[PDB]
Design a protein around this ligand. Sequence first.
Ligand SMILES: Nc1ncnc2c1ncn2[C@@H]1O[C@H](COP(=O)(O)OP(=O)(O)NP(=O)(O)O)[C@@H](O)[C@H]1O
Ligand SMILES: Nc1ncnc2c1ncn2[C@@H]1O[C@H](COP(=O)(O)OP(=O)(O)NP(=O)(O)O)[C@@H](O)[C@H]1O
Ligand SMILES: Nc1ncnc2c1ncn2[C@@H]1O[C@H](COP(=O)(O)OS(=O)(=O)O)[C@@H](O)[C@H]1O
Ligand SMILES: Nc1ncnc2c1ncn2[C@@H]1O[C@H](COP(=O)(O)OS(=O)(=O)O)[C@@H](O)[C@H]1O
Ligand SMILES: C[As](C)(=O)[O-]
Ligand SMILES: [Mg+2]
Ligand SMILES: [Mg+2]
Ligand code: NA
Lengths: 173, 173
Amino acid sequence: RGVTIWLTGLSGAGKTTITHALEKKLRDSGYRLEVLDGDVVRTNLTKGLGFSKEDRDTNIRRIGFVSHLLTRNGVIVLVSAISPYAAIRQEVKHTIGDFLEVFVNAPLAVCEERDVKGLYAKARSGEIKGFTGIDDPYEPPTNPDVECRTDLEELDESVGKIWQKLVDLKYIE
Amino acid sequence: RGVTIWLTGLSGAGKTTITHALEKKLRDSGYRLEVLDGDVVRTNLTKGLGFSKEDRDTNIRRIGFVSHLLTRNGVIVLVSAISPYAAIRQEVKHTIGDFLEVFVNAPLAVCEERDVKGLYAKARSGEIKGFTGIDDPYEPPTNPDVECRTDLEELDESVGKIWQKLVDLKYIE
Ligand SMILES: Nc1ncnc2c1ncn2[C@@H]1O[C@H](COP(=O)(O)OP(=O)(O)NP(=O)(O)O)[C@@H](O)[C@H]1O
Ligand SMILES: Nc1ncnc2c1ncn2[C@@H]1O[C@H](COP(=O)(O)OP(=O)(O)NP(=O)(O)O)[C@@H](O)[C@H]1O
Ligand SMILES: Nc1ncnc2c1ncn2[C@@H]1O[C@H](COP(=O)(O)OS(=O)(=O)O)[C@@H](O)[C@H]1O
Ligand SMILES: Nc1ncnc2c1ncn2[C@@H]1O[C@H](COP(=O)(O)OS(=O)(=O)O)[C@@H](O)[C@H]1O
Ligand SMILES: C[As](C)(=O)[O-]
Ligand SMILES: [Mg+2]
Ligand SMILES: [Mg+2]
Ligand code: NA
């Protein structure tokens, strides 16, 4: 029953939006789950970390650590974090086993015109350095379990895709 | 039936030892559980932290964060950490709710006598500053749920106390 559903993508691509929707849908149906949103655990579990390659690796690995413990005790874990490095993602997947990579995919141009929290403009001004997709890498999942193209898709479809994978893999009724 | 069993006491008091014995006994009975030892989490989950007041509060709270997720998902969590500051212990207690505070009470002289890791000698020489009970506080529990005087007990008696408080409080049959 326990699985980690791992949502990676550009900032503003739609990880959190999906995670809240998926979260609600799973809980209504009575499934047990926990959520680890990158923005939020950075105020908690990963307080004090920044955005260097070393610090993102600490962040993601720490998250992987707590996901691993929940998943192996039968909990659906909803993770949403940029996870820009593919090798780190692959590492965490190997560690948890029961792992669905979800590529929340919006082209950068969309993510930027969206500018949900004003961050992208700050990244272009030079105000913020090393912003992912602007002057810091993002390594797209080459073979993800689900891909949600959120320029193209509506929220219900994007959630539907993930929900459907869970059914196919027999993680839920 | 999920619960956090929280062992606090001086270095050398006997938490880690009580934890393995309580672990194997619970695990043999078929209960599902997770161990979070202060020594061990400080090589992954709280790597980077020291023993300033600041850093210990960070350590305990983070341990607490992880226990709380596991506890409200039905898991039995065995924590053994010094947890020197009382107000912080109480905080984690109210946050998790299903919480056993186990005071592993050995006097400092007994603990120094065993010096399992050779650490007290190092605290006295000054090689290690701010060692609990030599150069930093230890605020004993005032009204702990269970107290183990490991000076006046054997394992099975100490482990045995906890195990039965667990069945009184109905966490395990
Ligand atoms: N499937 C979707 N289709 C269309 N628009 C979407 C979809 N999912 C999310 N959005 C919208 O696009 C934006 C994505 O927001 P958000 O979930 O905060 O992205 P994000 O990846 O979580 N950014 P961040 O959490 O800070 O790294 C919001 O304005 C949503 O309304
Ligand atoms: N009730 C007891 N009576 C006598 N010796 C004991 C008792 N319980 C444990 N010990 C011994 O205590 C020694 C080590 O204690 P230990 O469990 O490591 O304390 P600790 O403070 O929890 N270590 P740590 O987790 O690093 O802070 C071992 O040699 C045990 O055999
Ligand atoms: N330099 C930055 N790059 C990306 N996101 C940043 C940056 N600075 C602040 N943020 C914020 O931090 C969030 C990303 O945090 P994470 O998902 O936890 O990143 S990750 O790379 O370590 O996985 C973004 O949503 C964004 O709001
Ligand atoms: N200054 C120190 N005080 C106490 N323990 C220390 C100190 N330095 C190293 N240690 C080691 O770290 C262990 C304590 O770690 P914790 O249980 O995680 O401490 S706590 O205060 O933050 O709860 C001890 O068992 C001991 O081996
Ligand atoms: C040994 As000291 C730095 O507490 O005076
Ligand atoms: Mg977000
Ligand atoms: Mg120990
Ligand atoms: Na859309």
